[PDB]
Structure 1
Amino acid sequence: RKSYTRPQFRRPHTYRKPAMAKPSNRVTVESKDIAAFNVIRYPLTTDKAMKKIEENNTLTFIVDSRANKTEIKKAMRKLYQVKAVKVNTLIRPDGLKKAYIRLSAAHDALDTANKIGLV
C-alpha cells in the first residue's frame, strides 16, 4: 500500500488526453477586406461636425455601435489612409454610435473631408 500524509482522500491526478480541434462548423465566406466598411458607416455634416473639421482637425462619423475605439482607428487607416491620434465616442440618444476622430497634424481633415465627398 501507499502512504498518505493527509487526513482525507483526494482524487489522484491521471493522464488527460487533450481535445482535438474539430472541423469548422461555420462555413460561410467572410471577406477581411470589407470589415472596415461595417465599422465606419457614414460621416456627419452638422454645424457642430463642420466646426470641428476646420478648428480641431477632427472628423465626425457614425460608426458601428459595437465597434472599438481601437478598431475605429484601424478602419480609418484602411479606408482613408490617415492616422487617427484620438477617437472619442458616444452613443446617441437615438441609439447610434458617433465618433469624433482627430487626425494627426500631418493629415489635413479638410482635405480628407473633400476626398470623402462630405465637403
Structure 2
Amino acid sequence: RKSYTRPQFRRPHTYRKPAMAKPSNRVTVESKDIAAFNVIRYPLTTDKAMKKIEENNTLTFIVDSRANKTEIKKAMRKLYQVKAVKVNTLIRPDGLKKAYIRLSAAHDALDTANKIGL
C-alpha cells in the first residue's frame, strides 16, 4: 500500500474465515453391520462354477454391480472366515456382476461351499 513494483494492480490478501459444519441433513438410521449382505448377493451353481471349486479352489458369486474388488474381499472376510487371494470380475450381458474368488489354499473351497449349502 506504499510502493507498487508491478505494472498492474492485483487484489490484496485479506483474512478469510473458514466455513462451519452444519447439522446433518440426512437422519436415516443406517446399520453398519449389514452392508456385506448388500455386497454379496448369492452364489452360482453352473457347470463351469462347479469345475472351478474343486480344481482351482475358487468360488463364484453374483455381487452388486457397483462394488469393487477391495470391498468384495472385505465382504468375503466378514461373511465367511476365509481369506481371498484373488478376485476377478466381469459384467454379464444381462447386466449383473459376477466374481471369481480364489482362496488362499489354507482354506478349502469345497468345505466352504458345503457350509454355504451349495
TM tier, smaller: over 0.9
Mind listing any 5+ residue stretches in structure 2 that lack a counterpart? none
Aligned-residue sequence identity (percent) comes to 100
Q: Distance in 2 between matches of 1:50 and 1:5?
A: 78
Aligned residue for 1:13?
13
1:16-63 deviations in whole A, cap 9, x for unaligned? 111111111110000110000000000000000010000110000000
Match for residue 62 of structure 1?
Answer: 62
Q: CA deviation at 1:115?
A: 0.4
Runs of 4+, deviation exceeding 2 Å: none
Once the two structures are TM-superposed, the CA of residue 116 in structure 1 deviates from its matched residue by 0.5
Q: Cα deviations across residues 53-91 of structure 1 (Å, max 9, x unaligned)? A: 001100000000000100000000000010000000000
Match of residue 101 from structure 1: 101
Q: Distance in 2 between matches of 1:68 and 1:95?
A: 16
Structure 1 unpaired stretches of 5+: none
The alignment's TM-score, normalised by the length of structure 2, stands at 0.97
RMSD: 0.7
Describe the SS at the equivalent of 1:16: coil
- Give me the TM-score of the superposition, normalised by structure 1: 0.97
